[PDB]
Amino acid sequence: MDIILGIRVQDSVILASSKAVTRGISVLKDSDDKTRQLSPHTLMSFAGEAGDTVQFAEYIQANIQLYSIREDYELSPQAVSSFVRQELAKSIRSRRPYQVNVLIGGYDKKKNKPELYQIDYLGTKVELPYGAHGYSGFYTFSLLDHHYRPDMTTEEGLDLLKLCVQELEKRMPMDFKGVIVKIVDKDGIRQVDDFQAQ
Amino acid sequence: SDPSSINGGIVVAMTGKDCVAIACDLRLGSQSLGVSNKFEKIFHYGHVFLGITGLATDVTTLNEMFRYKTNLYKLKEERAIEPETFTQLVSSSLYERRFGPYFVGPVVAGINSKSGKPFIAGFDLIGCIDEAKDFIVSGTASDQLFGMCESLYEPNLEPEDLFETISQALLNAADRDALSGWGAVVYIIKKDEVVKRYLKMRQD
Amino acid sequence: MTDRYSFSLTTFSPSGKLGQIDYALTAVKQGVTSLGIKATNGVVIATEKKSSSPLAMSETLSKVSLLTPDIGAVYSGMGPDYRVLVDKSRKVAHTSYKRIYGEYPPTKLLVSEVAKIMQEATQSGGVRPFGVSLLIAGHDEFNGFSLYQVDPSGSYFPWKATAIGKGSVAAKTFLEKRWNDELELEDAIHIALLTLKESVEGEFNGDTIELAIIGDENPDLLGYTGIPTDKGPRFRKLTSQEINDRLEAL
Amino acid sequence: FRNNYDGDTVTFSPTGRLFQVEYALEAIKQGSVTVGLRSNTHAVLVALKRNADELSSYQKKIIKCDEHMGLSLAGLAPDARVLSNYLRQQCNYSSLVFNRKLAVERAGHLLCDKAQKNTQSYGGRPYGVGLLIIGYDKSGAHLLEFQPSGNVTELYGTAIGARSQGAKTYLERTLDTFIKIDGNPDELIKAGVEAISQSLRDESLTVDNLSIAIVGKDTPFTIYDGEAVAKYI
Amino acid sequence: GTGYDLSNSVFSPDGRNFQVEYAVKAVENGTTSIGIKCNDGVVFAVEKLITSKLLVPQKNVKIQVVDRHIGCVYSGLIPDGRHLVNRGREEAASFKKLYKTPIPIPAFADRLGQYVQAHTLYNSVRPFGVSTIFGGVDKNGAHLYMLEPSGSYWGYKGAATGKGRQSAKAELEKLVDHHPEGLSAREAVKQAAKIIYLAHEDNKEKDFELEISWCSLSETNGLHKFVKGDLLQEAIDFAQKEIN
Amino acid sequence: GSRRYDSRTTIFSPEGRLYQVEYALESISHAGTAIGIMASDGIVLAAERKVTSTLLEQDTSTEKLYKLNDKIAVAVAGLTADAEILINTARIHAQNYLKTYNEDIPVEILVRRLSDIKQGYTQHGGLRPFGVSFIYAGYDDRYGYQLYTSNPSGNYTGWKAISVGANTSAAQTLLQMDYKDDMKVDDAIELALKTLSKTTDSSALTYDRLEFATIRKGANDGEVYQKIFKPQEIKDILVKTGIT
Amino acid sequence: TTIVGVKFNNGVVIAADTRSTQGPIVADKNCAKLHRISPKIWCAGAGTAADTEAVTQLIGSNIELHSLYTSREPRVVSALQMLKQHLFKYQGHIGAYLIVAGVDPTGSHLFSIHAHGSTDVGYYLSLGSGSLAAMAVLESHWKQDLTKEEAIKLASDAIQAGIWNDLGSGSNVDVCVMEIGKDAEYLRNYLTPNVREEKQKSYKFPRGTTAVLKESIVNICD
Amino acid sequence: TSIMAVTFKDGVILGADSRTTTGAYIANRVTDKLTRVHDKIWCCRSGSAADTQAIADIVQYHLELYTSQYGTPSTETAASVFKELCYENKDNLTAGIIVAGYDDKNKGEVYTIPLGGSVHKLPYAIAGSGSTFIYGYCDKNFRENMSKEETVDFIKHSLSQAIKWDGSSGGVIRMVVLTAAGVERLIFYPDEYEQL
Amino acid sequence: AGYDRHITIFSPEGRLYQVEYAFKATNQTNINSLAVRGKDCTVVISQKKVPDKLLDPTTVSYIFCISRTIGMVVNGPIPDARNAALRAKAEAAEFRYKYGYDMPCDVLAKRMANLSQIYTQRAYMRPLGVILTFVSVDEELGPSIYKTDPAGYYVGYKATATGPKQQEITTNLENHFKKSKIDHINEESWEKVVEFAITHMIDALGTEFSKNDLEVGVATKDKFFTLSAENIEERLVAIAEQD
């Protein structure tokens, strides 16, 4: 599968997502951004079935933006993830389920704390310090189980991810073409344009 | 494939002297991959406790469903639902999905606020109620749990004693199951108070 | 064909009155008197069996009906409307409660269901309100004994004692005089009989009066034995004989 | 009286009348005249096309339903489109399913029943148009008259619309004559134009004003307009 | 008050349904038609007013067949009549499909009866503007019926409706009295042609066309058939002769 | 047809007003008065029980104050039965929200949903509107204590103090006269009782004729608490405030 | 499971063992398999437990409502007809196999229903995995015109054959007697021939045996 | 299962064994396969017991409502209702039904509706798993217009043979005689027919 | 406003005029009927009037066989009567199918009464202008008479009468029972109960009857049937040899 990683440090949540989009024998694109901003402080990454993936991300984005406008308020990260979980949980028992896994990284301005939610296509949600979807988790959970620390700074988090991406670029069979990294904190969502060699 | 073996997990309930205990492990994995060591499977509505094993998404969904129903029930009845009544509510809610069931193994534990009598019950995924007086087990290590309970259990244990018995039953059963363990939490319930303890256990 | 009456038949008039409900209440007013009295250990509801012909068998017509083994109902107004309401009440007690919680509904909730059905006949398209007022007496573990009145509007209220129908004003006044919070069931039955006598013109006996109570459990009316937690219904219709015995002590 | 019983088609008057149906019939009378007549080999339709301005066209009044059937309308044009379309479908069904050309008599029964439904139900309205149906089937030439009341009748000839009474008396007179115009279409048409002109008064049938249609033994229902009718004025 | 006659299913203070009654007016204003029950069948005849010479003779048939053993004729609004027959046909087809045997006349009568009565139950529909005479032969004899706009119907020895129902009924009553043993299909056809002629006096202004049909166990084998050619003329004459 | 009996409950008057809404409001104006007052540390809901008797069971009664949530409650002025239909759907909407977002529903979202349901009976369906006006008292972590009001039209607004039902004009003037932004729950409780006391169409204002509720954030805790006063409790607060 | 039905001179009796199993594991050593349709119409089921239980309560609910509506005692043939038409509709997907017995104004009755919707009538019946062991007994001792006592014995012996010889059955014997003129009498645990012997040791642990990482009080009140 | 219907001089007779098996196990050894859908219109069922019972119950319902409106139904009409149900629902049914009835006008009649839902009127009919074994016997021994005694004998011998070779058939032999005289139920035990 | 008299909604007096006018229609046929209970039978008698000579007397009836055991006599216009008869038959056949036993006389009555109550509450359905008298020998209750009207009302009777001269027949029957002190005709045969019925029909109406002026329906254990002109003539003869 594609690489979808997330790590929650002291005051931010960082999401790293592979850039490759491959079909059969060809890597069609190497600059794919597997993410959608749901609200100024909530970001969602996704991996899964070819078309379902974006259709789901955009459908969720549309709903959150609608709520924001209607209520002139921003739902908390926990609120948004519960909404996403329910959508997936409905889907799994529908005619053709959405085959999409997501990571929701958000900064809760009311609690002043970053939050990372991992949710699979079945609607299985869990809140974690770090998470991953696909085969990635098989090399990153133990890596992070070892190197991760609660009080880490955003900069330490990025170095921690770099350690993850290097492990993946070493042992994973596929060429996922690097990752796009985004930070979610009290000031919003920004993209680290320099990870191709940080 | 088997919805009941994807995430893993166990729950066990026991009756004692004017008390009941309900325990569960904390694991949540995806086949061989352990994913979360903080996934609790016990919930409560008023003084009624519900543990749920099986497919995690359904565990979560069912808890939100019963919180929702017990909330309306309280607003209408003007009293908190009792263990016996809740057991019936769980049963009918499960059977209502007879041909598209929730893949879970529910367990109810509590003390009837009016009779003070301890109560526990189990259910299969479609609602069949198992009402034992001693213990109820559920999950991927249920065989092991049945073994430990049948051996370790004895009637009218005092809270402090029932705690040792329930904990040893859970702990040793979980250690013979690849998909259970990774932490555990035990609830000791009494008419007046409820104590919650996290156990120390193997992390492999 | 096809009911094309999809609009309300009860609407607000310039004064704010809901005509059809008002008229339904007037129908209730012409109806035979009925009352209910709550004692400390029971409730009694009663009414007159106003036989429409000496050739008719007044027993084949019950104005007092069992809804659940611990809940009974009586009325004043249009008998047919009551009959269908009883059928619907008995069924809603199952579909909306027993089949979900495995136990019969407490008096207040079943009353709430009936009231809902009646409110809908006040707003749904193509119908008229029910021309009746009911008195529902019952018992349930966490609420004890209770008595409720449900009017054509769907409104309901709890009572210590009350009367509806023909001579309700006089009957209520008489009840306010004899009622106290220490009455035992037999006392209420007695006061009930006295109140009903003032409303009856002709014969007053166990064959012209219909009376039932909600009291202790009747294991003898259960139909089986072997289950301790099942002690029998609390609802019991008094027999013609049981009524006469109490009339001699009138 | 009437005013209290003409609110909809689902109400009988104290004398057993259906005013909405009668009012619909009135739309026909207000319609331009059209005539129909048949011999034993052909059936002809002659219709007077009416125009709004001298800058407008003369609204068509003849619709072809199949190679062997067609009709002329008087009254609400849209209602004619609906009915003729239903007729086109019934003719079509007969051919596709049974490989059989629909009998004019059957077409009449079908129309009668379709109109009858809008005279016994609430919410609908009767059709406001009259139709003259001509056709050649397995039993020769035919002419039918359709009224919104649902009444359809087979005749040798007839006319509907404003002043239709003129042409009708003429045909009832010329009967023995035209009914024998077999094997000669031009004669049958001329006999038709003569019947129709018996209802003129305003003007005289011009080239872009006259409309004729014919069908027969070896003549598929075809419509003639303009220059094509010049040789008949 | 008033206005009880503006809506179909409304009961007037005297328990009547005025719209049905107005439907009857439409029936009495119609052509006359009759039915005569003979010893092994039934005959149907009807008056067909010749509006003009333009009406192709013998072409606008009024009597209708249902299944293969039933005849139906009616007076009033013709379209309503066809409507009722279409229903009867669907009704008969349904009965045969499930029970195999063609529908018995009594059974058929009720099918039309219930359908017609149904049109007096709601204000969203209008009652039927026709009285229908119908019948045929079945497993146990011949049966003649007449159905009113109210949905009311009974079995008859003879029946008439329309403009000249009184003349007809008078004639039918004579026949009933002078033939307790029973008329024959052959006789009934003539007798029917006569009554239509006699009853045509209540409309003697316009010329008419006679139409007869019958269903006899012996004369038609229990199948409904129209009377044509020689048998028709022979009946026409029998009338023209006794009309003087 | 049916059209004849259709009142057309959803049309405009020549002045652009909605008949049924106006008439439903007229109905509400005869209902027991309900008052709502918002303070810095809580909210007070008080209502006068219209019509009572010696035999009415006040301990088991509730005709004006209902709990919708653990953080939201309403005071009713109008048809009790109508109110119950709306209250129940409001309770369901609150639970759907909780199940969807795992957060209690913000007070305004719930009030808006209920008001929208009412608005519908105003624009389509041909049914009569609900003869009810609500005063919502609730608390959420975005706006804290809030007081809203909705009526048959489906329109809603926020208030510091408001009244619905009978004599709101008099009640409003009295409230607008003694209310002060820095009030306190206890001050409000007293203001509410005094107002009802001066607007009542009854002799005196006794406890058996009242319903009281408060939503406070008990200092000794940190959470929000709803308290629907019990008969005795009302009798007490009645003497204390000097109404005995 | 082992369930049986036996008619006698003035009524009918049904019995069943009390073992509930999930695969080879005994989940409930003393469940009650005898269900009530109405006061005097009892039922015993085998097959998908949730199904026998649900189908029994559904028809039971409707039987009560029907009884109230007709002012008559429920009839066994009504429970039979409603059950079978329901089961038939679900083409066997509702795995309920039942033995319904009872007394009503028309007499005493004994029927068997299968998941697909077919019914049978008889004087003695058995269903369940213990079906054959029980029937071997019934075919060996049944006789016409049994006395209430003989019936209880025969039925009781039948469940025992199943308890001892069938792995799908065990524990106790539950009985319910329905006599034409009296109330139905439910005899829960009429027999208890399988009491667990006193254990050889007590496994009561010395307090402190279990290591705890964290503790706290749980709030129940609102 | 072995079932048959035989028309004779005075009407018609239906016969059947009483064995119902689920595999090699005999679930019922005294089953009553002669099913009444009307006073003098009965049927013998084969195939799915659940299916044939549901069919019979519906047919009975239709004939009861038929009687209420049009009087007693012909045997042909009863066979027609069975057919309609079996044909129209052929994909979800496994039912082989023999309909037999006595009419005063038509006397005794026999109609067989096999698996497909087709109908066949016959002098006599045999069906069920055990019937294959008696096609030869019945064909050689059947005669039209036999007497009640002869018909009961023909059926008793035919079925005893079917029971003899077919393990799915057995128990007792039940018969139902349908004539103007009424309805008569007959039963024959093993110890009698086993030695024929 | 004035439409509270066209559809079934309340009048300011809480009355349903349409239901009252429906009651009026029940006498439109100017026929009287009565029902009495024997020891083990139930008899219904109804005048039979056939004015038109063109009618087939055999097809004029107001007695119906609803089921093998239930009989129903109707007082009111024939079309509504047949509408009611067809429904009752369908209802009786369905009950037997779903519940496994014959629909009881009183239950069918309640069912039709409920259906009637509905026409009384829903505006698009008009009440039927008929009164239905159901009879049978119920397997649980014995001889039974249950009558339903356009109001949705129904009750059981010891005996009852219906039609224009219902009151005269009623008081006649009332007097007889005040005398006998029992609630039924203490006769063993239905023939005699039918004779009692017709006898009192004559006394009360002050009229003599031929075999074609009456119509008789009888209910016995497991069967309800109607008598033929001849079965009745035999009855008329018997009563004649007493007066």
Asked if E142 and E9 touch (Cβ cutoff 8 Å), the reply is no
Question: What residue of A is the nearest CA neighbor of B33?
Answer: A138
Place of tokens 């060809």: A26
Into how many domains does chain G fold? 1
DSSP state of E202: G
Asked whether the beta carbons of residue G106 and residue I139 sit closer than 8 angstroms, the reply is: yes
Question: Residue H124 pairs with which residues in a beta bridge?
Answer: H6
Question: What residue of E is the nearest CA neighbor of H87?
Answer: E98
Task: Give the number of other CB atoms < 10 A from CB of residue H195.
Answer: 7
Closest CA to D195 of D215, D216, D181, D182: D181
Which residues neighbour B32 within 8 Å (Cβ) at sequence distance 6 or greater? B178
- Closest chain I C-alpha to G152 CA, distance in angstroms: 29
Strands C156-158, C144-150: pairing is antiparallel
Please tell me the distance from the alpha carbon of residue D214 to that of residue D229, in angstroms, as a whole number. Answer: 12
Asked whether the beta carbons of residue I86 and residue H69 sit closer than 8 angstroms, the reply is: yes
Asked if F149 and F76 touch (Cβ cutoff 8 Å), the reply is no
The token pair at A161 is 């991810």
Which candidate in E2, E31, E51, E120 is catalytic?
Answer: E31
I5: which chain E residues are within 8 Å (Cβ-Cβ)?
A: 1, 4
The token pair at C237 is 């219709």
Asked whether the beta carbons of residue C4 and residue E118 sit closer than 8 angstroms, the reply is: no
Q: How far is CA E27 from CA D7, E23, E75, E83, in A?
A: 22, 7, 6, 15
What is the assigned CATH class of domain H1-196?
alpha beta
Provide the domain limits for residue B134: 1-204
H53: which chain G residues are within 8 Å (Cβ-Cβ)?
A: 84, 117-119
Please tell me the distance from the alpha carbon of residue F50 to that of residue F201, in angstroms, as a whole number. Answer: 10
The letter for the amino acid at A126 is V
Please tell me the distance from the alpha carbon of residue C135 to that of residue C157, in angstroms, as a whole number. Answer: 10
Q: How far is CA D53 from CA D59, D225, F16, in A?
A: 11, 19, 42
Q: How far is CA C11 from CA A86, C123, F129, I8, I123, in A?
A: 42, 8, 8, 16, 15
The token pair at G67 is 């009884």
DSSP state of F47: E
Asked if E86 and E94 touch (Cβ cutoff 8 Å), the reply is no
Q: Domain residue spans in chain I?
A: 1-243
Question: What residue of F is the nearest CA neighbor of D8?
Answer: F1
Asked whether the beta carbons of residue D8 and residue F2 sit closer than 8 angstroms, the reply is: no
**3-class state of residue E10 by DSSP:** coil
Class of residue E143 by CB neighbours under 10 A (exposed 0-12, middle 13-18, buried 19+) = buried
DSSP state of C127: B
**3-class state of residue F142 by DSSP:** coil
Print the SS3 string covering chain I. CCCCCCCCCCCCCCCCHHHHHHHHHCCCCCCCEEEEECCCEEEEEEECCCCCCCECHHHCCCEEECCCCCEEEEECCHHHHHHHHHHHHHHHHHHHHHHCCCCCHHHHHHHHHHHHHHHCCECCCCCCCCEEEEEEEECCCEEEEEEECCCCCEEEECEEEECCCHHHHHHHHHHHHHHHCCCCCCCCCHHHHHHHHHHHHHHHHCCCCCCCCEEEEEEECCEEEECCHHHHHHHHHHHHCCC
Please tell me the distance from the alpha carbon of residue E83 to that of residue E116, in angstroms, as a whole number. Answer: 11
Phi–psi pair at B197, nearest 5 degrees = -125, 135
Hey, which residues 142-201 in chain E have their CB within 8 Å of chain H? Answer: none
Class of residue C159 by CB neighbours under 10 A (exposed 0-12, middle 13-18, buried 19+) = buried
Q: Thinking of the domain I1-243, which architecture would CATH place it in?
A: 4-Layer Sandwich (3.60)
Please tell me the distance from the alpha carbon of residue G135 to that of residue G159, in angstroms, as a whole number. Answer: 9
Q: Do chains D and G touch (3 or more CB pairs under 8 A)?
A: no
**H20, H28, H54 ranked by CB distance to G88: nearest:** H54
Q: How far is CA F33 from CA A135, A165, F162, F200, F240, in A?
A: 66, 69, 11, 8, 22
Asked if H172 and H188 touch (Cβ cutoff 8 Å), the reply is yes
The token pair at G222 is 């609102």
Q: How many CA atoms lie within 13 A of B68 on its CB side?
A: 21
Q: Cα–Cα–Cα angle for F15, F17, F20, nearest 5°?
A: 140
Phi–psi pair at D87, nearest 5 degrees = -70, -40
Hey, which residues 1-60 in chain F have their CB within 8 Å of chain D? Answer: 1-2
Question: Residue F74 pairs with which residues in a beta bridge?
Answer: F66, F136
**C5, C108, C172 ranked by CB distance to F55: nearest:** C172
Please tell me the distance from the alpha carbon of residue F121 to that of residue H42, in angstroms, as a whole number. Answer: 59
Q: Domain residue spans in chain C?
A: 1-250
Which candidate in G1, G2, G21, G56 is catalytic?
Answer: G1
E neighbour chains, 3+ CB pairs within 8 Å = C, D, F, H, I
Closest CA to D122 of C5, E8, F1, E119: F1
Q: Do chains E and G touch (3 or more CB pairs under 8 A)?
A: no
Into how many domains does chain E fold? 1
- CATH no. of A1-198: 3.60.20.10
Asked if I98 and G82 touch (Cβ cutoff 8 Å), the reply is yes
The token pair at H126 is 């045999």
Hey, is the C-beta of C229 within 8 angstroms of any chain E C-beta?
no
Q: How far is CA I164 from CA C40, F7, I31, I76, in A?
A: 53, 39, 7, 11
Please tell me the distance from the alpha carbon of residue G131 to that of residue G169, in angstroms, as a whole number. Answer: 10
Q: From the DSSP assignment, how many helices (H) and strands (E) are in chain C?
A: 7, 11
What is the homologous superfamily of the domain C1-250 according to CATH? Aminohydrolase, N-terminal nucleophile (Ntn) domain (3.60.20.10)
Q: Do chains A and D touch (3 or more CB pairs under 8 A)?
A: no
Asked if F47 and C88 touch (Cβ cutoff 8 Å), the reply is no
**3-class state of residue E161 by DSSP:** strand
Q: Cα–Cα–Cα angle for B97, B98, B102, nearest 5°?
A: 55
Closest CA to D80 of D54, D105, D45: D45
- Closest chain D C-alpha to E229 CA, distance in angstroms: 19
Buried b (16+ CB within 10 A) or exposed e, D144-174: bbbbbbbbbbbbbbbbbbbbbebbbebbbeb
Q: Where are the beta strands (DSSP E) in chain H?
A: 3-8, 11-16, 20-22, 25-28, 34-38, 41-47, 95-103, 107-113, 120-122, 124-127, 173-179, 182-188
Strands I142-148, H41-47: pairing is unpaired
Asked whether the beta carbons of residue H81 and residue E99 sit closer than 8 angstroms, the reply is: yes
Domains assigned to chain F: 1-244 (3.60.20.10)
Q: Cα–Cα–Cα angle for I176, I181, I184, nearest 5°?
A: 70
Please tell me the distance from the alpha carbon of residue C209 to that of residue C250, in angstroms, as a whole number. Answer: 14
Mutate to test the interface with C, among B76, B108, B112 (most CBs of C within 10 A): B76
In sign, the C-alpha dihedral spanning I224, I230, I234, I237 is: positive
**3-class state of residue A99 by DSSP:** coil
**3-class state of residue H105 by DSSP:** coil
Catalytic residue status for E31: yes
Asked if B26 and B37 touch (Cβ cutoff 8 Å), the reply is yes
Please tell me the distance from the alpha carbon of residue G198 to that of residue F123, in angstroms, as a whole number. Answer: 76
Into how many domains does chain B fold? 1
Question: What residue of I is the nearest CA neighbor of E147?
Answer: I79
Length of chain D (residues): 233
**B30, B38, B57 ranked by CB distance to A89: nearest:** B57
Asked whether the beta carbons of residue E155 and residue I58 sit closer than 8 angstroms, the reply is: yes
Pairs of residues, one from chain G and one from chain H, whose beta carbons lie less than 8 Å apart? 27
D1-233: in CATH 3.40.50.1980: no
Mutate to test the interface with F, among C40, C108, C111, C123 (most CBs of F within 10 A): C123
Pairs of residues, one from chain B and one from chain F, whose beta carbons lie less than 8 Å apart? 17
The continuous run of DSSP H or E covering E174 comes out as helix E165-177
Strands A188-192, A179-185: pairing is antiparallel
Mutate to test the interface with F, among E121, E122, E123 (most CBs of F within 10 A): E123
Please tell me the distance from the alpha carbon of residue H65 to that of residue H70, in angstroms, as a whole number. Answer: 9
Please tell me the distance from the alpha carbon of residue E142 to that of residue E165, in angstroms, as a whole number. Answer: 22
Asked if F114 and F86 touch (Cβ cutoff 8 Å), the reply is yes
The distance between the two most distant Cα atoms of chain D, rounded to a whole number of Å, is: 54
The token pair at A126 is 């869990």
Question: What residue of I is the nearest CA neighbor of F6?
Answer: I3
Mutate to test the interface with G, among C71, C110, C224, C237 (most CBs of G within 10 A): C224
Locate breaks in chain B with C to N over 2.5 A; list the residue preceding each.
none
The token pair at A186 is 């009290």
- Closest chain B C-alpha to G41 CA, distance in angstroms: 22
The token pair at A147 is 């190197």
**3-class state of residue G119 by DSSP:** strand
Asked whether the beta carbons of residue B85 and residue C102 sit closer than 8 angstroms, the reply is: yes
DSSP state of D32: P
The token pair at C132 is 């009746």
Asked if A24 and A35 touch (Cβ cutoff 8 Å), the reply is no
Asked if E32 and E163 touch (Cβ cutoff 8 Å), the reply is yes
- Cite the active site residues of H: 1
Please tell me the distance from the alpha carbon of residue A113 to that of residue A9, in angstroms, as a whole number. Answer: 10
Please tell me the distance from the alpha carbon of residue E234 to that of residue E218, in angstroms, as a whole number. Answer: 19
Q: How many CA atoms lie within 13 A of F236 on its CB side?
A: 6
Asked whether the beta carbons of residue H48 and residue G118 sit closer than 8 angstroms, the reply is: yes
H48: which chain G residues are within 8 Å (Cβ-Cβ)?
A: 116, 118
Q: How far is CA D232 from CA D163, D187, D224, D228, E34, in A?
A: 21, 10, 11, 9, 50
Hey, is the C-beta of D4 within 8 angstroms of any chain F C-beta?
no
Asked whether the beta carbons of residue H54 and residue G122 sit closer than 8 angstroms, the reply is: no
Question: What residue of E is the nearest CA neighbor of I123?
Answer: E122
DSSP string, H76-90: HHHHHHHHHHHHHTG
Task: Give the number of other CB atoms < 10 A from CB of residue G192.
Answer: 11
Q: Domain residue spans in chain D?
A: 1-233
Angle between helices I78-99 and E105-118 (to 10 degrees): 100
Phi-psi region of G36 (alpha: psi -120 to 50; beta: other; left: phi over 0): beta
Phi-psi region of C226 (alpha: psi -120 to 50; beta: other; left: phi over 0): left
The token pair at B71 is 């909330």
Which residues neighbour B63 within 8 Å (Cβ) at sequence distance 6 or greater? B43, B50, B52
Q: What does R_g of chain A's alpha carbons equal in angstroms?
A: 16
Q: How many CA atoms lie within 13 A of C239 on its CB side?
A: 3
DSSP string, C165-226: STTHHHHHHHHHHH--TT--HHHHHHHHHHHHHHH--S--STTTEEEEEE-S--GGGTSEES
Task: Write down the H helix ranges in D30-103.
Answer: 77-98
Angle between helices G49-70 and B83-95 (to 10 degrees): 100
Please tell me the distance from the alpha carbon of residue H42 to that of residue H13, in angstroms, as a whole number. Answer: 10
Please tell me the distance from the alpha carbon of residue E84 to that of residue E151, in angstroms, as a whole number. Answer: 12
Please tell me the distance from the alpha carbon of residue C7 to that of residue B203, in angstroms, as a whole number. Answer: 67
Q: Domain residue spans in chain H?
A: 1-196
Q: What is the CATH number of the domain that holds B45?
A: 3.60.20.10
Buried b (16+ CB within 10 A) or exposed e, F59-86: ebbbbbbbbbbbbbbbbbbbbbbbbbbb
Please tell me the distance from the alpha carbon of residue B86 to that of residue A166, in angstroms, as a whole number. Answer: 52
The token pair at B158 is 């005092």
G82: which chain I residues are within 8 Å (Cβ-Cβ)?
A: 98-99
Task: Give the number of other CB atoms < 10 A from CB of residue F15.
Answer: 5
Please tell me the distance from the alpha carbon of residue E221 to that of residue H120, in angstroms, as a whole number. Answer: 27
The continuous run of DSSP H or E covering B43 comes out as strand B42-45
